[PDB]
Structure formats: C-alpha cells, structure tokens
Amino acid sequence: VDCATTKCVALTFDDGPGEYTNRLLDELSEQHTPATFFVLGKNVKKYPKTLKRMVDEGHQIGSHTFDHKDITKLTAEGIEHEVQWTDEAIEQAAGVKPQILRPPYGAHGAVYDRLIPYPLVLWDVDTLDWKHHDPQKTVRIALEEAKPGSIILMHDIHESSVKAVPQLVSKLHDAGYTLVTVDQLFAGTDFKPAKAYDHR
Ligand code: NI
C-alpha cells in the first residue's frame, strides 16, 4: 500500500496479549485487516503461539515495555530493562524483533527517548476504551476522529475491543480508508529511532 496517496489508517491495540487477543485476531482475519499490537513483555511470556499468529497473519508487533511503567519514572538501566526484557520475550515467542515502541501512558521525553532503539509511536485518535470499555463508543470516536494518516489507539484488555472491531473495520472501510500496519503507514517517510510520531 502507498499511504502517500492512499488514505491510510493504522488500527493499534495496547497492553496485550490476553484472553481476548485470539478472538480479536479472528475478527481481523475475517475482514482481511492488519493491525499493530503494542505488547506488554510480561504478557508475552504466556502467549507465544498468539504472537506467532500476529506474524503469520500479517500484523505488526511493537513493544509496550515489559511491565507498563512510565519510562520517565525510570533510570537509564530501568529503561534498558523495560526495552530489553520485552525484546527477549518477543524474540522467544515469535522469532522477531519489534521495530517500534509505544511508551506507556504516552509518557516520554527527549532525554529518555534517546535510549530507545526504535521510533516512538503514539497516536492521534484515542478511543478512550481504557475508560469506558464500550464497543460502540470505541467505534464512534475512531470513525469520526480518524483522518488520512491517523493512528487509532485501542486496548486489547477487554471484551469491548473484540465486539468493536467487526463494526469499526466495516465503517472505516465504508468511510474510504485502507487499514495498514504502522510500518506501512510510515513507509517512505523519515521514520527514525528515539523520535516520537503520532500521525503520518
Ligand atoms: Ni498501555
């Protein structure tokens, strides 16, 4: 996909994997749609086959650190642990290395980011599903606030994401968008480590 011309949107899911991730992957599969999963390293240990699904079925795996700590609260070595422990978990699980990282709570800063070997990927559309856990509100906010180049934040922690996705994909397609991984979204642009990006 050429997102320089084509109207692209990236669906992203934080804080997984968990008990709903496979249903989520099933729904995404049913509508031939890729997504980007910013995974928690602590959770990855328990879900190796599910991470293999992400690779096998066209999705992108990103790092969300290991135990979801605000990285700006940490020391240099603390940040090292969060990055490296998560990478090891992802490599052991799926045989790949993430190429992007999303900082917990969106919290970051130049002095910290310089320690992160990947582009920092934020978002421009917060579905707020972490507060309301409501599938229809997730769809409404994602649909109405998305624009070409948007990155939509959702959470793989709760049933409402599973219930939201079939409708969310349908409506984004009907609204003229092509759904892509974060990699595809930034393909061709200057997408470099230790920098933060919230939109193409
Ligand atoms: Ni998170």
Author numbering: 42 to 241
What wording appears in the published article?
The Ni2+ most likely originates from the protein purification by nickel affinity chromatography. It has been proposed that one of these water molecules, coordinated by Asp55, is the catalytic water acting as a nucleophile during catalysis. Superposition of the two ArCE4A structures reveals that the water molecule coordinated by Asp55 in the substrate-free structure indeed has a position that could allow it acting as a nucleophile during catalysis. The other two water molecules, which coordinate the metal ion in the substrate-free enzyme, occupy the same position as the oxygens of the acetyl group and the hydroxyl on carbon 3 in of the sugar bound in subsite 0.
CE4 enzymes are capable of removing acetyl groups in chitin, chitosan, and CHOS, thus converting GlcNAc (or A) units to GlcN (or D) units. The protein has a somewhat deformed (β/α)8 barrel topology that is characteristic for CE4 proteins.
